[PDB]
Amino acid sequence: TKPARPDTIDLDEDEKEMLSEARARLANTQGKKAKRKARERQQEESRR
Amino acid sequence: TTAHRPTFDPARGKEALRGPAYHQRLLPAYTTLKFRQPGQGGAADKSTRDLRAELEAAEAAHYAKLKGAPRRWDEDVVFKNQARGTEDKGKRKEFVNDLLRSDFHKRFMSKYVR
Amino acid sequence: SLKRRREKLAKSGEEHGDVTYINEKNKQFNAKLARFYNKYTAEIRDSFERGTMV
Amino acid sequence: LPAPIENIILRYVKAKADWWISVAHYNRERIRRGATVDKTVAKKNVGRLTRLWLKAEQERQHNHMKDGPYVSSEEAVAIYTTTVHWLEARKFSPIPFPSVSYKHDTKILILALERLREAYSTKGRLNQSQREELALIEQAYDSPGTTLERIKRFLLTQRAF
Amino acid sequence: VKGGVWTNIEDEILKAAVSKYGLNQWARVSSLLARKTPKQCKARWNEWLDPSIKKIEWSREEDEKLLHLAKLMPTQWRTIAPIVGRTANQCLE
Amino acid sequence: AALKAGQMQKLREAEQSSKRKPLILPAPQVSDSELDEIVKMGMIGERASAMARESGAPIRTPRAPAQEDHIANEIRNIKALTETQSSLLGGENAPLAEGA
Amino acid sequence: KRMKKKEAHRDDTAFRDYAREAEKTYKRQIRNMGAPDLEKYMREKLSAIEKAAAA
Amino acid sequence: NKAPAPIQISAEQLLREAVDRQQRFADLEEL
Amino acid sequence: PEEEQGSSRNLDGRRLRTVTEAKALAEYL
Amino acid sequence: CDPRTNPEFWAKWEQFEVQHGNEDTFKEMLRVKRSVQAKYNTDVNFIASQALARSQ
RNA sequence: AGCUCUCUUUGCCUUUUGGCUUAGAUCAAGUGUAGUAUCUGUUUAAUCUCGUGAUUAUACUA
Helix, strand or coil: CCCCCCCCCCCCCHHHHHHHHHHHHHHHCCCCHHHHHHHHHHHHHHCC | CCCCCCCCHHHHHHCCCCCCCCCCCCCCCCCCCCCCCCCCCCCCCCHHHHHHHHHHHHHHHHHHHHHCCCCCCCCCCCCCCCCCCCCCCCCCCCCCCCCCHHHHHHHHHHCCCC | HHHHHHHHHHHHCCCCCCCCCCCCCHHHHHHHHHHHCCCCCCCHHHHHHHHCCC | HHHHHHHHEEEEEHHHHHHHHHHHHHHHHHHHHHCCCCCHHHHHHHHHHHHHHHHHHHHHHHHHHHHCCCCCCCHHHHHHHHHHHHHHHHCCCCCCCCCCCCHHHHHHHHHHHHHHHCCCCCCCCCCCCHHHHHHHHHHHHHCHHHHHHHHHHHHHHHHCC | CCCCCCCCCHHHHHHHHHHHHCCHHHHHHHHHHCCHHHHHHHHHHHHHCCCCCCCCCCCCHHHHHHHHHHHHHCHHHHHHHHHHHHHHHHCCC | HHHHHHHHHHHHHHHHHHHCCCCCCCCCCCCCCHEEEEHHHHHHHHHHHHHHCCCCCCCCCCCCHHCCHHHHHHHHHHHHCCCCCCCCHHCCCCCCCCCC | HHEEEEHHHHHCCCCCCCHEEEEEEEEHHHHHCCCCHHHHHHHHHHHHHHHHHHC | CEEECEEEEEEHHHHHHHHHCCCCCCCCCCC | CCCCCCCCECCCEEEEEHHHHHHHHHCCE | CCCCCCHHHHHHHHHHHHHCCHHHHHHHHHHHHHHHHCCCCCHHHHHHHHHHHHHH
């Protein structure tokens, strides 16, 4: 219920990792089979 | 992930494959038809107006049969007569087309969730 | 038709304001959502802008 | 959403709900009879009855707000008056708020913490709230006075949980 | 430990996580905010970050309603709060 | 910025044209009938002046009485009905300064 | 007539059905062909006249 | 340094950063 | 850098892109 | 009416309240004024107000 | 009152969420170590043929 505390000049390491993982997790959209199909499309293209 | 998907184009029925008879699929069973016997009706038409007449005859008979046509220990206490007007429930059973508010469901939840 | 396809691809690739999406299909879906629903969500959008009120 | 489309969806959601509730009734009768030993059927049925119970409970809470206190004010005053006459006849002394230096606080707190710890007694896998409640119990063991001050502060102050 | 003050990093990551995950997946949301529990992320949305929460100063009509309802239904803050229109903690404070 | 501001301001104007709420006015204490007899008396007085010749500036809102401060009345009512301790202990009921 | 035509196009911009879209497309395509060559039409008419007279 | 930063991150900034971090045939036989 | 972080906020809760666009509209007017 | 774009309107209401009113209605006026400031405390209204301020 | 070019507005949605049940279910991490990759730092001239080759004058140099 207390309001938010502003970010400091220097963040701590838990907060840098938290921001990096937030960006990666928000960007990710696929599952494991979809990722393997994209990988194997590239590998079949190069093999051909 | 579109592996797990709905059905927009459900499978169409096919003519049977035609070939020589080797595989045994459907064992014979109930290989005689029963027919309606004397007294079992079915093959007994009267007429439209006849059937109408027996319909209102039977229905009027049912309606006519329904209508009938041929210091004290209990004065110490603080709350009194608190169960009048409770046992008088039970005049007509009302079907309710909302399952979660039916008396059946209310009974069920009272019995099973305690 | 091909020219209109090029022009609409360019104008969709332009971005005015906040990124609310994470890919192009998401961007298109969010634009469709804005086209349909913005006439009903204006008070909630004002609340998310200013930070308060219903 | 266009009204004819909404009508179609409401119609069929009710039909699915009817089928789902009838299966709930049938499987509870089978579970009560013992006619099934299917563990998935049992956990599914308990989920269904939990959802049904909470729907009924929300409707009951809503009906209490709409149709007022069911106990009449005359009934409430009569109940309260019976209670005061009883307790005055029994000469009952009301229970005080626990003192700062109540001489039995340590014994009372140790009994309470032993009860919560024995609620944890036979546990193999612990989730996060379980591990933090064990940690809070051992902190209360290590600092009984601080825990007592925090408890009495909560009892004086907190009204929203 | 899992708790403490809510900072701006945590609130903004919570809002972006809610925008990906909705409001019924607080374990995914907390998995982004790995300094808070799912219960804490849900409590933060419900008590602060929900856009229907008025954080402006109380009007006189609101104060009169709050005192009147606190007299009617005593110490029942989860009941009082929807009628007043503020959160239970806001009404109590 | 200009073109986004034009599209912006058209959107905001569509908002505001929907966002308007009506005005509830208090009933006037001096209605049309008493306007009619006050203008009748005024014309009677000025025609009497005409035939004779031929032949508090501000208004202030009154203060609500201090005993009608419903808020402060309700804090003292709440304190008298809440921090009071058990009725088996006897004691004095704090005064419910209710008023009206 | 010009301004009523412009106003009609403005009112008929939004989609109603494919019969209207087909009528609009056909009218625009006729305009884009423009004026027919009545001299070539009349030459073809006279050639067809003498050919059908022979036949 | 624990003084408040001049720039405070936002969810839309996070989304923008996530978005940011996101033949010659010679023969009939090859054809 | 402000252009990179245009969707971030000031201390008074205002987006840096809105500060920039307000200044630009002031210049345009 | 937004205060940072209608100072003459708010001054007129202040004149009306000091000619006809008391301090309770005056604090009600200021409560309403800062509530309207909170309502208009958005980025869009900031753009409009800054443009008007540096156009005037 | 025409046709092309450009801008704006209107339209069109144009890659734009493809099932189910007990929200299907459950979830705090850290650290060590190894390996692989990342970063913070002689000159010129004309000729022919397939230019080239060939013909070919000549400079510079204690």
